[PDB]
């Protein structure tokens, strides 16, 4: 599913991501834009043999099981395919764990490089939330 911008904002808010660990909703929308283009089906192989999955490009080394990443820890206790669903629940729950890991949203490279320090509220402008 490719979410609309405000559609994704509303889903993320309903799931309790807005202000989660101090990250306002626009941070999450911005991260999802650059990680996945709001596409739940997005996948990308990493150099180390792991793969990133879903709207927030969650990695198969630490977080989910994809059956092909040796040494995977599956800390979210989910198949990586669950992160591709049109229902973002599993991605949100796992993102909450990731953002609580110690480095906040710096866990998302695209957030660090393209969202952090910018006017992230722009990402939710116009939306009815
Ligand atoms: Cl915001
Ligand atoms: Cl933080």
From Swiss-Prot:
It is found in: Secreted. Belongs to the glycosyl hydrolase 22 family. It comes from Gallus gallus. Its main location: secreted. The active site is at residues 35, 52. This is Lysozyme C. Monomer. One of its GO terms (cellular component) is endoplasmic reticulum. It holds the Pfam family Lys. InterPro entries: Glyco_hydro_22, Glyco_hydro_22_CS, Glyco_hydro_22_lys, Lysozyme-like_dom_sf.
